[PDB]
Amino acid sequence: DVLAKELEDVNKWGLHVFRIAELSGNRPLTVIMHTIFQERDLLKTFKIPVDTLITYLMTLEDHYHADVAYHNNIHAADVVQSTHVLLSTPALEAVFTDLEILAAIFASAIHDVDHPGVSNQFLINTNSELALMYNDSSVLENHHLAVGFKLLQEENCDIFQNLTKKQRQSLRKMVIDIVLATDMSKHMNLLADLKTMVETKKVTSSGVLLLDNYSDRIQVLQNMVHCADLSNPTKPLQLYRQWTDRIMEEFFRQGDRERERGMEISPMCDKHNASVEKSQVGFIDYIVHPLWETWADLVHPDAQDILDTLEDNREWYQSTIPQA
Amino acid sequence: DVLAKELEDVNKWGLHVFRIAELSGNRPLTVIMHTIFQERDLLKTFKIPVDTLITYLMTLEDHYHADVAYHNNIHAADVVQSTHVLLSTPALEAVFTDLEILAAIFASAIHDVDHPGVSNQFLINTNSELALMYNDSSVLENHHLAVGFKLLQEENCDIFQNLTKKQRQSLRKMVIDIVLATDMSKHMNLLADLKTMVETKKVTSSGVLLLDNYSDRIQVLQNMVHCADLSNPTKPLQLYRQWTDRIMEEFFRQGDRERERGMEISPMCDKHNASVEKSQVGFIDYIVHPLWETWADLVHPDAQDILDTLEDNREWYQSTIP
Ligand SMILES: COc1ccc(-c2ccn(C[C@@H](O)CN3CCOCC3)n2)cc1OC1CCCC1
Ligand SMILES: COc1ccc(-c2ccn(C[C@@H](O)CN3CCOCC3)n2)cc1OC1CCCC1
Ligand SMILES: [Mg+2]
Ligand SMILES: [Mg+2]
Numbered sequence: 001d002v003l004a005k006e007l008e009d010v011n012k013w014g015l016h017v018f019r020i021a022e023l024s025g026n027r028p029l030t031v032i033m034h035t036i037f038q039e040r041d042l043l044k045t046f047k048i049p050v051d052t053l054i055t056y057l058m059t060l061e062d063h064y065h066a067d068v069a070y071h072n073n074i075h076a077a078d079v080v081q082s083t084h085v086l087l088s089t090p091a092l093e094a095v096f097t098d099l100e101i102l103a104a105i106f107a108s109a110i111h112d113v114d115h116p117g118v119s120n121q122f123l124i125n126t127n128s129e130l131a132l133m134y135n136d137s138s139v140l141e142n143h144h145l146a147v148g149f150k151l152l153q154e155e156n157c158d159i160f161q162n163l164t165k166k167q168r169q170s171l172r173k174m175v176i177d178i179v180l181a182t183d184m185s186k187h188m189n190l191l192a193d194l195k196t197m198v199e200t201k202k203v204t205s206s207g208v209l210l211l212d213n214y215s216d217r218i219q220v221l222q223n224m225v226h227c228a229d230l231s232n233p234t235k236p237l238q239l240y241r242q243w244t245d246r247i248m249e250e251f252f253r254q255g256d257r258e259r260e261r262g263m264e265i266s267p268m269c270d271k272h273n274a275s276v277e278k279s280q281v282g283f284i285d286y287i288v289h290p291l292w293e294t295w296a297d298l299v300h301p302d303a304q305d306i307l308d309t310l311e312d313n314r315e316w317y318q319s320t321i322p323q324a
Numbered sequence: 325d326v327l328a329k330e331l332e333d334v335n336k337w338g339l340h341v342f343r344i345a346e347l348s349g350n351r352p353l354t355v356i357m358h359t360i361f362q363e364r365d366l367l368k369t370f371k372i373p374v375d376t377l378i379t380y381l382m383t384l385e386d387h388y389h390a391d392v393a394y395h396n397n398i399h400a401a402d403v404v405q406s407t408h409v410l411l412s413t414p415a416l417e418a419v420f421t422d423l424e425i426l427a428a429i430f431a432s433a434i435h436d437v438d439h440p441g442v443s444n445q446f447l448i449n450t451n452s453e454l455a456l457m458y459n460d461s462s463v464l465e466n467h468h469l470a471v472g473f474k475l476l477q478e479e480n481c482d483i484f485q486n487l488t489k490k491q492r493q494s495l496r497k498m499v500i501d502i503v504l505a506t507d508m509s510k511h512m513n514l515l516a517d518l519k520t521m522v523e524t525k526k527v528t529s530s531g532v533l534l535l536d537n538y539s540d541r542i543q544v545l546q547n548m549v550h551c552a553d554l555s556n557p558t559k560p561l562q563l564y565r566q567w568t569d570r571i572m573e574e575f576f577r578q579g580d581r582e583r584e585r586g587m588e589i590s591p592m593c594d595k596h597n598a599s600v601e602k603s604q605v606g607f608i609d610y611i612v613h614p615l616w617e618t619w620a621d622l623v624h625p626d627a628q629d630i631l632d633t634l635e636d637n638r639e640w641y642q643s644t645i646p
């Protein structure tokens with residue numbers, strides 16, 4: 001119906017993912033993954049039974065928390081679809097194998113599963129069972145990976161059942177490498193290396209990037225999924241505003257639990273004292289734009305429109321903050 | 325009775341740790357930890373109730389598997405006692421705080437807890453729940469930490485209850501840093517960095533090391549406990565021989581599991597095709613001597629005897645190849 005019409009934009013930056021969420025009965029991750037797997041012919045390439053795929057996807061989506069305002073199945077679907085668009089960037093044409101493509105998309109789908117709506121630092125500071133299990137290191141991201149893989153064991157859920165042993169081992173490694181790179185504490189190191197990769201990048205005559213080993217390849221996929229994870233401010237304003245509403249609700253819910261515990265309230269988590277405009281401008285200035293201008297460098301000029309939107313959105317949000 | 329005369333060597337390399345296990349009713353970890361904590365006055369410094377210490381130690385010791393030949397409570401006791409000795413080396417006098425000493429000793433005591441007697445690679449290859457939990461990375465070592473800390477939560481087991489919040493945080497970070505560094509897959513990187521530290525080491529007039537910050541201190545502690553973990557071949561030969569017998573028994577049991585599942589048998593785990601003595605010599609040549617020669621460099625000349633014993637023991641296994 002209308003849904004099929006909205007899913008026509010699946011290859012475009014700015015897909016109305018919230019509409020798809022409404023229209024699909026709160027199943028945007030399932031419907032968007034299915035569409036992209038069909039679009040990329042992934043079922044045939046990897047002999048994935050369509051019943052298996054949908055079963056796994058619905059279980060996966062089920063394990064995103066409905067009551068978590070940002071880190072839910074809509075965010076998962078958004079990162080999946082954004083990664084799907086970045087994979088098709090002309091600078092990367094025929095660079096990645098189907099398995100590498102499958103790894104990047106699967107990693108995006110699972111990358112925040114079972115997210116509790118609080119940060120790693122909160123989990124560490126409250127002596128959580130999760131932090132105890134993971135020794136305070138990439139606590140959430142390790143857990144997302146564990147849950148995402150573990151769900152493959154449920155009945156008729158093994159979508160990788162017809163991969164070779166070699167393929168499965170390789171996919172598992174890449175997926176781990178990619179989701180661990182979504183840990184924000186690794187952002188500055190990822191960025192510093194991505195900048196150096198750009199400085200020395202090699203291209204064919206056709207202008208596609210030359211990535212001739214695993215380290216270079218996985219580094220590009222890591223930063224690709226990281227960009228997609230941090231892509232909200234690069235989206236049309238009507239979408240970006242909705243993401244901003246959700247993250248601040250999630251942050252203030254964490255702030256409320258911190259205040260109740262007599263804890264220092266984390267930056268941007270105090271509903272009484274935070275400023276949304278200032279918060280987003282700082283986010284863009286110190287995190288999102290430095291990352292995206294570096295990606296844009298890597299794939300120039302593929303991402304110029306994305307970078308333009310980001311810069312317009314930054315200009316917009318700063319316009320109501322009084323300045324000298 | 326006789327346990328007390330053996331415990332007099334708790335300050336010595338080559339403590340009769342197997343004797344201690346027998347004489348203590350297979351409580352070598354509890355006995356040795358209690359002795360060290362009393363010796364270093366750690367109960368008073370950190371206000372650790374003695375019953376709480378003993379209760380935690382007994383529970384920790386119970387979570388080392390009695391049916392695992394090498395990675396059991398005797399190995400934990402050995403690495404604890406060996407770290408205790410390394411910490412007292414003259415070149416390290418007054419270098420570490422009591423909290424750093426506590427962290428090294430606690431890390432040593434928990435560093436292989438709940439070890440199942442199979443390798444990280446075996447756990448990964450067999451798609452174990454543990455490898456699934458830890459995404460194939462430092463699977464055992466992450467697990468040893470989780471268990472060692474979790475046991476603090478059992479009744480009357482929180483030996484850190486009277487540390488400040490900041491002290492707990494700092495100790496927790498150090499213990500994690502140390503135990504994750506015992507993952508053998510990190511040996512080459514750890515050693516490479518230890519060589520770098522030796523090349524640029526700063527000592528006072530009396531040859532005491534001058535560490536400048538957390539990075540320096542934690543690096544020395546990481547390598548110290550790694551040395552203690554890999555100290556078997558530097559011990560008096562009779563100790564070394566028993567340790568070799570035990571690790572081969574545990575390796576062989578893993579190979580039996582691999583063979584039974586139709587897997588490639590891991591290096592040195594095939595009881596039908598082993599060269600125990602040749603393998604100990606290769607172990608020393610490629611892993612243990614390069615590490616201990618580098619440690620000996622750092623604390624020169626404190627570890628000269630240890631190095632000499634290593635080289636003697638190398639010749640024992642060499643002259644013992646059929
Ligand atoms: C739609 O907007 C967002 C979507 C995803 C996130 C997000 C993921 C992880 N973080 C948290 C910090 O690790 C990074 N911070 C950020 C701002 O200052 C610098 C260091 N944030 C944030 C968004 O913005 C928040 C608005 C209040 C602050 C950020
Ligand atoms: C007394 O000698 C040893 C004392 C301790 C170790 C030791 C402790 C932990 N490890 C790591 C393994 O648990 C993991 N390995 C990975 C590859 O092979 C299978 C299992 N090894 C080894 C010793 O020697 C081995 C026998 C021949 C040389 C090596
Ligand atoms: Mg995340
Ligand atoms: Mg170990």
Ligand SMILES: [Mg+2]
Nearest residue numbers: 371485486487
């Ligand atoms: Mg008290």
Ligand SMILES: [Mg+2]
Nearest residue numbers: 534535536540
């Ligand atoms: Mg220094």
Ligand SMILES: [Zn+2]
Nearest residue numbers: 075111112229
């Ligand atoms: Zn995310």
Ligand SMILES: [Zn+2]
Nearest residue numbers: 403435436553
């Ligand atoms: Zn050990």
